[PDB]
Amino acid sequence: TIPHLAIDPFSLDFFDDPYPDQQTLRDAGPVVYLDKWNVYGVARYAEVHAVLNDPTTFCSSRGVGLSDFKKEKPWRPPSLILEADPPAHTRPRAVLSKVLSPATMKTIRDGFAAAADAKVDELLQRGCIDAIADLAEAYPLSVFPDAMGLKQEGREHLLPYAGLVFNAFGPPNELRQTAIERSAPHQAYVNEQCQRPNLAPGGFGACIHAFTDTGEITPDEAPLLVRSLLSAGLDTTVNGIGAAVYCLARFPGELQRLRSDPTLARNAFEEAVRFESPVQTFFRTTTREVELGGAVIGEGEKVLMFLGSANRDPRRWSDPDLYDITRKTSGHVGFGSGVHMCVGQLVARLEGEVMLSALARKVAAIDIDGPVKRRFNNTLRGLESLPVKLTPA
Ligand code: HEM
Ligand SMILES: O=C(O)c1ccc(OC(F)(F)F)cc1
Ligand SMILES: [Cl-]
């Protein structure tokens, strides 16, 4: 009843061009079995959305990577939010929601926008730049560590640590094994920065620790919640902004529409998140036997959700393979859906908006002018290098 496929969604060939295999996964059936890793897969929008929105049946506390925490030791102590189910999930989630709230966004928006404008002005002086290292990486590095309250020393550990976290959700392939082999110095740095004395006043980290007297979290929960922001808060935005710039570079007609109305910046970023889906995949684990799209899945089974495939499913989207900055993007699953839906989405959207606004106002053309190099990661989709020429407006 359930089709069995040999596709390895964590192979370099798949990462290099996932779209044919993602159509094969969608068209084989609503539920497939991936023989390579002994997991179920759902690649259509309908089933991905259904799984995300039944956290009781499709839980997160047994891990959202391939590894089942009931069978293996987690590579690091479980996240108190990402790798927790209700009710344990609920109060840590509420704390992060209030730490990354609209009021916080109002306090940081002016500085984030000034840094975006400054970066684009700087890049225009150089003309030919690498849109990854010099923009998608450089801009988040210029605002987010400071917004966390991190000291300057050791920030070079942040992107390596994030690459490790996202590789570690994958199966035990070479990408994951190599990441873990090199992890010790990055874990040491990150864990140390999570302690209250090491987080500067008024930043996200200090605000988490300040919430430890309301009865929502205790002081011993705050370091791991800081760890969540140091795991998820930087490399995601790097690949979100990189996706948006890559989209504008490939689709000059959409850059031209964005220039003509810079208030489309926020939706142009949201559409880039749908179109590229920088966070490609997450797993759930079934807590009971369950019927999903005509399939009977037993208890204790891993289910792989293809978020990027769901965001390209023609059953849900018109012209899914087109980048359209005025698309009605509401409902895409690039930030997830339901109780775990990205708690940092207001930070991600703020960064993406102000960067695309700066480009819209200052840049007339974005032309790829060198070899494009892809970066391979078990969970993240994005580029290693994107050489572009920026023409000033
Ligand atoms: C374009 C940028 C981003 C994308 C595409 C993205 C994607 C996602 C997705 C798909 C989830 C759902 C995980 C699941 O269902 O298991 C999630 C959750 C989460 N994200 Fe984001 N994220 C981004 C930026 C950020 C930022 C900037 C932060 C923090 C500053 C952040 C922190 C988190 C946390 C802590 C969770 C776990 C929430 C929970 O389990 O309740 N993310 N993200
Ligand atoms: O809590 C954490 O450590 C954590 C780590 C990664 C993560 O990934 C993404 F969902 F994509 F943002 C979310 C949360
Ligand atoms: Cl760690």
Give the span between the Cα atoms of 363 and 260, in whole angstroms.
11
Omega of the bond leading into 387 within 30 degrees of 0 (cis):
no
Contact call for residues 388 and 368 (beta carbons, < 8 A):
yes
Q: Could you tell which of 231, 234, 239, 349 is best to mutate to test the pocket of ligand 2, judged by most ligand atoms within 8 Å of the CB?
A: 231
Q: Structure tokens of 339?
A: 């109780």
CA of 377 to the centre of ligand 2 (A): 14
Residue type, 210: A
Give CA angle at 320 (316, 325), nearest 5°: 110
- DSSP string covering 238-288, please? HHHHHHHHHHHHH-HHHHHHHHH-GGGHHHHHHHHHHHH-SB-EEEEEESS
Coil, strand or helix at 334: coil
174 φψ region: left (φ > 0), alpha (ψ -120 to 50), beta (else): alpha
User: Which residue, 75, 51, 55, is CA-closest to 65?
Assistant: 75
Give the integer Cα–Cα distance in Å for 340 and 122. 37
* Nearest CA owner, ligand 1 atom 9: 335
From the CA of 160, the nearest ligand is 3
Tally the domains of the chain: 1
Length of the chain: 393
Expressed in angstroms and rounded, the spacing between residue 79 Cα and the centre of ligand 3 is 10
Give me the domain span that covers residue 19: 1-393
User: Is the beta carbon of 96 within 6 A of some atom in ligand 2?
Assistant: no
Pocket flag, ligand 2, residue 231 (CB < 6 Å): yes
Indicate which atom in ligand 1 lies nearest the CA of residue 60: 16
Instruction: Looking at 2-44, list the stretches that DSSP marks H as alpha helix, in order from N- to C-terminal side.
Output: 12-16, 19-28
342 is annotated as contributing to ligand binding: yes
- Is 109 annotated as belonging to a binding site? no
Distance separating alpha carbons of residues 347 and 105, to the nearest angstrom: 7
Q: Are 381 and 280 in contact (CB under 8 A)?
A: yes
For a substitution probing ligand 2, which of 76, 82, 204, 237 has the most ligand atoms within 8 Å of its CB?
A: 82
User: Does the annotation flag 257 for ligand binding?
Assistant: no
Residue whose CB lies within 8 A of the most ligand 2 atoms, among 64, 186, 228, 339, for a mutation test: 228
**Has 284 been labeled as part of a binding site?**
yes
- State the method: X-ray
Question: In 65-193, which residue ranges form alpha helices assigned H by DSSP?
Answer: 90-99, 102-126, 138-148, 158-168, 174-181, 184-193
Mutate-to-test residue for ligand 1 from 91, 227, 236, 353, highest number of ligand atoms within 8 A of CB? 236
The answer to whether the CB of 280 is under 6 A from ligand 2 is: no
Distance 187 CA to ligand 3 centre (A): 4
Q: 57: Cβ below 6 Å to ligand 2? A: no
Tell me the ligand closest to 140's alpha carbon.
1
Decide: 53 and 46 in contact? Cβ < 8 Å. Answer: no
Query: Do 244 and 356 touch, CB atoms closer than 8 A?
Result: yes
CATH of the domain at 301: 1.10.630.10
Kindly state the DSSP code that residue 78 receives in the 8-state scheme: P
Say if residue 128 carries a ligand binding annotation: no
Resolution of the experimentally solved model in angstroms = 1.5
- How far is ligand 2, taken at its centre, from the CA of residue 287, in Å? 22
User: Which residues are CB-neighbours of 359 under 8 A, at least 6 positions away?
Assistant: 120, 245, 248, 255, 258, 366
CB 10 within 8 A of CB 175: yes
Ligand 1 atom with the shortest distance to the CA of 352: 1
